[PDB]
Design an enzyme around this catalytic site. Structure first.
Site, PDB file in Angstrom:
ATOM      1  N   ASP A 219     -13.056  15.873  41.437  1.00 25.25           N
ATOM      2  CA  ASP A 219     -13.981  15.593  40.368  1.00 25.25           C
ATOM      3  C   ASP A 219     -15.341  15.947  41.027  1.00 25.25           C
ATOM      4  CD  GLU A 299     -13.886  20.124  38.115  1.00 21.57           C
ATOM      5  OE1 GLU A 299     -14.920  18.880  37.913  1.00 21.57           O
ATOM      6  OE2 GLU A 299     -13.618  20.233  39.133  1.00 21.57           O
ATOM      7  CG  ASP A 367     -18.487  10.607  39.440  1.00 20.09           C
ATOM      8  OD1 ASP A 367     -18.586  11.192  38.712  1.00 20.09           O
ATOM      9  OD2 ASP A 367     -19.617   9.989  40.376  1.00 20.09           O
TER      10      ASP A 367
END
Ligand SMILES: [Mg+2]
Ligand SMILES: [Mg+2]
Ligand SMILES: [Zn+2]
Ligand SMILES: [Zn+2]
EC number: 3.1.-.-
Lengths: 387, 424
Positions: A219, A299, A367
DNA sequence: CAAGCGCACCTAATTTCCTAAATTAGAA
DNA sequence: TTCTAATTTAG
RNA sequence: UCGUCGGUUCAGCGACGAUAAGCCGAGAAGUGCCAAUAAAACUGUUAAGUGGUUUGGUAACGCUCGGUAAGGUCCGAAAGGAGAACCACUGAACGGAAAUUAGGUGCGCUUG
């Protein structure tokens, strides 16, 4: 290998809590006397005694310091079990041999022992058996034959121990045979007035080999530079960026007061970003090999709300992938979607300090939740199904 | 007379010696002090073991003069450590040993009962200096020189130091007032120490001295009360006059939180750090937080120094003779006070020694419903109303800050007896 | 995040101390 | 021969 | 933004350093790993069983001990130069040292 776990003692099984408590305090005086005497005898064994000791009035026949101490303290400490006295004396004499060079040099005065001293126990003197109606009993052998007669505490002293939680996982393996007892202690806490039973256990540590079914997510946090979570364990790791904030404040202040100098300041920025990426990428992969995961989801890569603000984001992926793929771990690039704004607890697809689900009510670090959300296998589609 | 205080003087330059020879001596003597302190504590514990075995086996305790050869354990300890710590001055070694044995003798019962462990002494132990081994003479030009006797006769013939070691000390500011009085005779130098500050790599000559306090004329019926409040660091009120003096915090735990956060952040950063930070032991890995050595301790020390001076000055300004405060040994309402992790005992310890210089008596009272008792009517409502801020009782409608009614209560003479006779 | 263990490092609260008298060895 | 600094030990 | 110097602490100011939350060297007291070896104590008729002691090697360690930047002036083109010499501000405060107890924190292993 040798790990401990506390099991608070509920109540004596055949005694009262007054008679049982009195016995423990007498065995604590004999334990502390043995610990201090074994230090005195180890002090003489090493030849550290001063001249007046064996000059005005006060080789020895045995071989080890434990042998000399055990037979001397055996007479007075006649209440402790003969096995437990050996373990208590061994602790004192092994601490004297550990600190022997500092004691002789003068870097340390003398080992000392507190008043509320733990009561040692050997493997053969502790036994845990489960009663059919879901009760846990630990039969403890603490007294010697002369002491059992006087105190009228014949047989062993059985105690009931609260075994709920991780303890029930460990304890249920001790009774099966997977885990084996090694030694034990009976500690006392004065801030809760409760007795405990530290049961050290010996086992074979689990061999963690890479698994393509365990997934560790990453993250890119807002207050933390990076956050790592797993869906198969509550373990978590965070790559905080405290050093990154300080460096950006340093450069900005130096750039303002710098009005070749600018050329050199820009060169330093490139090195810091690259080296921090090397340290950050290595930590992520090392915390993945430790947990036996073989998949790292994250990501795909403006400044954004992410903690790193402006950073070589694309460079970090090309060092996370390269380091992960040097060890067999694969990398899946999953678009963020609404991973941060989603509940990992009840699957509520639905400030940024603490995330609180409106339905489930699970409150944890945002988070951390964005890391568990990413960690779910193929989270990208399951969010897309709802949205 | 009647009070002892210290003042540090920085050692700039050793006369007739280099800073690489003097530094070597100062750390050689810093190891013989640790040896003497640690070995003299072993002999006290050893002699104690001998006595216990003697009483059981011979009826009564042994006599030191007949077995050790001395009337005290201190003399025997000097006889045994003298041959190994042969570099220290005999006088300095005697004081160093006396500290070790007096500590053992003071806490001997606790040591036997297990409540207190046998003292062990650290590596950076200060070096002792007796009154007779310290001499300060100032040249006309205005440069103070301190003559120190730190070496023994064998040492002075091995290091080639024929006479005492002379060091230049800076004497400026309030240290000039103290030193010029020492050189006159108003203050008498007592046993002193040499300390090393690791942050600045400086050696200080901590000189303890004796001074007669000033005795102001102050009535003993005037009492000021101090309440460590919840929105204010400390509040002061008097019974006779409706005057208030408040020490609003401003910056109290802003410093502590901003220092621990860096300390944890630095340590946590060590898990993922440069290659050079690992593989060089514990010191080089915890090295980044070595800049945060005593920032909190020094900030809380200076801040509490200011607060105590302000409090004592108000007592003198209003003519107060007795200062009553709370005995917080009972651990009452911690955390919720304005100070959260502050050193409430450093503040109280400072007020005591700064009030005795002013001739002000200090009385600690037992805090029991002090903040709950309305100071006008005298009705201790078990539940006041609000947790903090405005406090309104219901017998009188008296309205004031909860910290002013908790300072108008402590200011009442013998209120500790009064409060009990309101609940029994 | 939590709990056991091992280690060390911080900070608060609290107590005690902050020698002298007599003798001797070295230097002028 | 005097004496000032260092050593030693009782209380 | 964090540090260095300006008698100590705190804050400010002037100059300076900073990727310092960084870089580096020897070594073997402890943990770990490897190879040899098997004491004390206990239960047992013995036998046997539990227990893990001692030595050497290795160098991964929050392994041990250390080194590394920072005022002006001066010499040195410049690096650099002796802890060499000299010079260096404003405000508030200026009673400390050692030990112990208790709480917390961090790191490492295991587990949930
Ligand atoms: Mg400053
Ligand atoms: Mg100043
Ligand atoms: Zn939910
Ligand atoms: Zn009222």
């Amino acid at each position: 290998m040798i790990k401990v776990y506390r099991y608070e003692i509920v109540k004596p099984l055949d005694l009262d809590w007054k008679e049982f408590g009195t016995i423990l305090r007498q065995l604590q005086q004999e334990t502390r006397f043995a610990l201090n005497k074994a230090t005195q005898l180890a002090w003489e064994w090493m030849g550290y005694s001063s001249d007046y000791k064996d000059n005005h009035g006060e080789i020895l026949g045995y071989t080890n310091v434990h042998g000399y101490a055990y037979h001397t303290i055996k007479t007075k400490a006649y209440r402790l079990n003969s096995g437990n006295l050996s373990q208590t004396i061994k602790r004192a004499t092994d601490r004297f041999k550990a600190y022997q060079k500092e004691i002789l040099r003068g870097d340390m005065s003398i080992p000392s022992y507190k008043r509320d001293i733990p009561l040692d126990l050997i493997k053969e003197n502790i036994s845990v058996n489960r009663m059919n109606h879901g009760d846990y009993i630990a039969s403890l052998s603490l007294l010697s034959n002369p002491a059992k007669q006087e105190m009228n505490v014949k047989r062993k002293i059985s105690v009931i121990i609260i075994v709920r939680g991780a303890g029930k996982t460990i304890m249920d393996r001790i009774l099966s045979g997977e885990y084996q007892v090694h030694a034990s202690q009976i500690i006392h806490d004065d801030r809760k007035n409760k007795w405990y039973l530290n049961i050290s256990y010996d086992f074979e540590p689990q061999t963690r080999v890479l698994d393509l079914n365990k997934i560790m997510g990453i993250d890119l946090g807002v207050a933390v530079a990076a956050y790592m979570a797993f869906q198969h364990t509550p373990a978590r790791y965070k790559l905080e960026g405290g050093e990154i904030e300080n460096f950006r404040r340093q450069v900005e202040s130096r750039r303002i007061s710098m009005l070749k100098p600018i050329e050199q300041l820009r060169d330093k920025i490139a090195n810091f970003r690259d080296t921090t990426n090397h340290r950050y990428s290595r930590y992520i992969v090392d915390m993945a090999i430790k947990m036996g995961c073989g998949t790292i989801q994250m990501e795909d890569l403006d400044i954004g709300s992410r903690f790193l603000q402006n950073w070589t984001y694309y460079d970090l992926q090309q060092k996370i992938i390269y380091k992960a793929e040097e060890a067999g771990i694969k990398v899946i690039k999953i678009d963020p979607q609404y991973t941060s704004q989603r509940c990992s607890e009840c699957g509520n697809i639905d400030g940024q300090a603490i995330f609180k689900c409106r339905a489930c009510g699970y409150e944890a670090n945002a988070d951390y939740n964005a890391a568990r959300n990413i960690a779910i296998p193929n989270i990208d589609k399951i969010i897309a199904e709802s949205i």
